[PDB]
Amino acid sequence: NSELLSLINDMPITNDQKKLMSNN
Amino acid sequence: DIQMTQSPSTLSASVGDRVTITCSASSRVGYMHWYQQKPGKAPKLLIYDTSKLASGVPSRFSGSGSGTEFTLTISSLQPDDFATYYCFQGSGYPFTFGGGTKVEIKRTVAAPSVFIFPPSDEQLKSGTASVVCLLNNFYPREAKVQWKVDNALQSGNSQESVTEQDSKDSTYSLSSTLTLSKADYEKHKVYACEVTHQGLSSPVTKSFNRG
Amino acid sequence: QVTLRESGPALVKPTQTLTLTCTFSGFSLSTAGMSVGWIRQPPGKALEWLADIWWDDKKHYNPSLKDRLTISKDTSKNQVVLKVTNMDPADTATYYCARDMIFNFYFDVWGQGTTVTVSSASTKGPSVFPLAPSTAALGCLVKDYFPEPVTVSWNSGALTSGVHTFPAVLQSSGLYSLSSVVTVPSSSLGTQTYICNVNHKPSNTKVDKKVEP
DSSP: OHHHHHHHHHSOOOHHHHHHHHHO | OOOEEEEOSEEEEETTOOEEEEEEEEEEESOOEEEEEOTTSOOEEEEETTTEEOTTOOTTEEEEEEEEEEEEEESSOOGGGOEEEEEEEOSSSSOEEOSOEEEEEEOOOBOOEEEEEOOOHHHHTTTEEEEEEEEEEEBSSOOEEEEEETTEEOOSSEEEEEOOOOTTTOOEEEEEEEEEEHHHHTTOSEEEEEEEOTTOSSOEEEEEEOO | OOEEEEEOOSEEOTTOOEEEEEEEESSOTTSTTEEEEEEEEOTTSOOEEEEEEETTOOEEEOGGGTTSEEEEEETTTTEEEEEEOSOOGGGOEEEEEEEEETTEEEEEEEOOOEEEEEOSSOOBOOEEEEEOOOOEEEEEEEEEEBSSOOEEEEGGGTOOTTEEEOOOEEOTTSOEEEEEEEEEOGGGTTTSOEEEEEEEGGGTEEEEEEEOO
């Protein structure tokens, strides 16, 4: 999901949290 | 920002030894990553996500740690492992690497094959004479090479370049260049290179008579 | 396989701007999750991250080298460009580009790197002399060039074993010099031909010298 990712990236969180949410 | 302290900074171990490298971050981190780098080559990813083996990486390598303390461990060290190792964090900006750890491989003593090269005819036309002494495939890295022109020890007119450890036989190779002007060169007869190394019971001397 | 090739000037005067280009293949930067980062290595120093960029045009820079950094992309040509203003001799280093993903914030694939020297000195091509044989050793003397680096190969890369290429040394002239040697069967001399392939991109110089007894 290109859009689900671009959302996670836009969020204000630590890189670990983005990585956590994008892998999961 | 997040800094990384790596130890040891240097290391020497025999093939088969267990080797452990430590990285300690100034602040808490989610994952630690590790890079292997060969001389004049680009870094390759060894371990990612703290303990995950990158593709094409021998299970010989392994990772472990959490918070601010992580370690990389090479179970049974091998010749091809000569490299500089770096930890890497991407948990926060800026991204940072550790100072690095240099791994050398202890092997059995080996004596240098010594060669000598008189200046080429092509160089002698440009007006300079470079005499080259080559020590091939030796260990340990320590080696003394003295130049003698007509039995006169030379100083301040030579340079040495030593190779990076071999990734197969774990040996070093060295070159010693004596540089003279064509004029000074043709002023002398015998050019000799005297080598002293641990694998040599007595100093080896290679030489040649000008022309 | 994903590949990356950095390109840019080998030599650049102080205060001048460095413009690096990363051309890649195997993946697209317009793909979600994809990123490209730049990393450099000063002589005898550890690796330093510089900057990166993402498919959504998000950019990051290393505060140490701020505000001298400018990163941009062009997905059309599959390339990323990094600019460094006001260059200093201490900026002399090898520069790498590398792929990154948000699934994994590390650099899984790297370019081979390109070398940048900051100096007021001018470029000079090397002279390539034969080190003639007389197991037997032989090689080429690559003398008096600036700046780094120069690559040496043999028989176009066909001969690779026994080959030792020495780290360049800095002569008192301010010019670099280095040697490349190879050990070969004493018997293959005179029958087997050996050619050293010298390359000095910084001066667009290419030399192929035949070494013989």
